[PDB]
């Protein structure tokens, strides 16, 4: 007996002292110091300060730089938009709830928040995949005489959106569900309560297989092929210093992107998988945030990786930020 169940929540603290209140009614200061709530607040503040600009600036720049509006860039835009759902849907909310010490918006708030929060994350995630697929297609030319254009880019994006809804929407309608997670200030997919009227158990498998293993296998194969396609092209062009560099640089970028994709979702997956194998074993309200911490903060490093290091976007940002040019 480690949790306190409630009609709409799971407080990861034991009400044997009779102090646990609904995380929708009263501050959860008994499962974590008020200060740690502020630290939470602090971090949400950080993610908003950094996250908002980087992601907003991305869109903003695209509206102002013809060259950025190529269709091979849509998925990146998509990414930023997704990060923005994460900012306004997730971060700001939490910053706000965290400062009350509980989820002041109640069940439906939980649902809204959880939905937009997870929607964005999923979109972003699936973009990273879609992006991989596209580069694979474009660079490894696996298709006879195919040429990537606006329509693909569009589908590519639409797909992202679908996949996201394919995961965030079910909870809203009874396959799993959104409950206050961690310190009860943000809302998430219930992946740790065997709560059965919703079938969390299966859903989590669906999540784990479809929204983590598929992506991982696809992203791995794609960039694998790419880093092979480029490594090979260089071995066949050892005379061309650039091709050499390009190979070197693309490899480095892939290692970054992959390691980054892992840092972002491994935690969630790893934890989910553990919890799904080690039953009744309690997990603290803070430990339940570690995974969230890595995922949410991606809304900053993804744009750093996929946008700020992308040479064009960067030059554009610099130009814009410095009024004149470089």
């Amino acid at each position: 007996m480690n949790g306190t169940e409630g009609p709409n929540f799971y407080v990861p603290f034991s009400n044997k002292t009779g102090v646990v209140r609904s995380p929708f009614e009263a501050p959860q200061y008994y499962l974590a110091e008020p200060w740690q709530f502020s630290m939470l607040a602090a971090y949400m503040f950080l993610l908003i300060m950094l996250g908002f600009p980087i992601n907003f600036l991305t869109l903003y720049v695209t509206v102002q730089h013809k060259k950025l509006r190529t269709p091979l860039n849509y998925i990146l835009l998509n990414l930023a938009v997704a990060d923005l759902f994460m900012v306004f849907g997730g971060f700001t909310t939490t910053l706000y709830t965290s400062l009350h010490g509980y989820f002041v918006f109640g069940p439906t708030g939980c649902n809204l928040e959880g939905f937009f929060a997870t929607l964005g994350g999923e979109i972003a995630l699936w973009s990273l995949v879609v992006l991989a697929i596209e580069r694979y297609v474009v660079v490894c030319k696996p298709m006879s005489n195919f040429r990537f254009g606006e329509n693909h880019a569009i589908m590519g994006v639409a797909f992202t959106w679908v996949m996201a809804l394919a995961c965030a929407a079910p909870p809203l309608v009874g396959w799993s569900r959104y409950i206050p997670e961690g310190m009860q200030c943000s809302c998430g997919i219930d992946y740790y309560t065997p709560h059965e009227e919703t079938n969390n158990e299966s859903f989590v498998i669906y999540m784990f297989v479809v929204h983590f293993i598929i992506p991982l296998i696809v992203i791995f194969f794609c960039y694998g092929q790419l880093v092979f396609t480029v490594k090979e092209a260089a071995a066949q062009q050892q005379e061309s210093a650039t091709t050499q560099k390009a190979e070197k640089e693309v490899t480095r970028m892939v290692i970054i992107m992959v390691i980054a994709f892992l840092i972002c979702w491994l935690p969630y997956a790893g934890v989910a998988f553990y919890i799904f194998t080690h039953q009744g074993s309690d997990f603290g309200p803070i430990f339940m945030t570690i995974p969230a911490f890595f995922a949410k903060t991606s809304a900053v490093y993804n744009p750093v990786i996929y946008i700020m290091m992308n040479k064009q976007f960067r030059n554009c940002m610099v130009t814009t930020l410095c009024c004149g040019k470089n």
Partner: peptide, 11 residues
């Protein structure tokens, strides 16, 4: 493929 790499933001 430098061209396609520069198209993908990769190079």
């Amino acid at each position: 493929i430098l061209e396609n790499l520069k198209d993908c933001g990769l190079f």
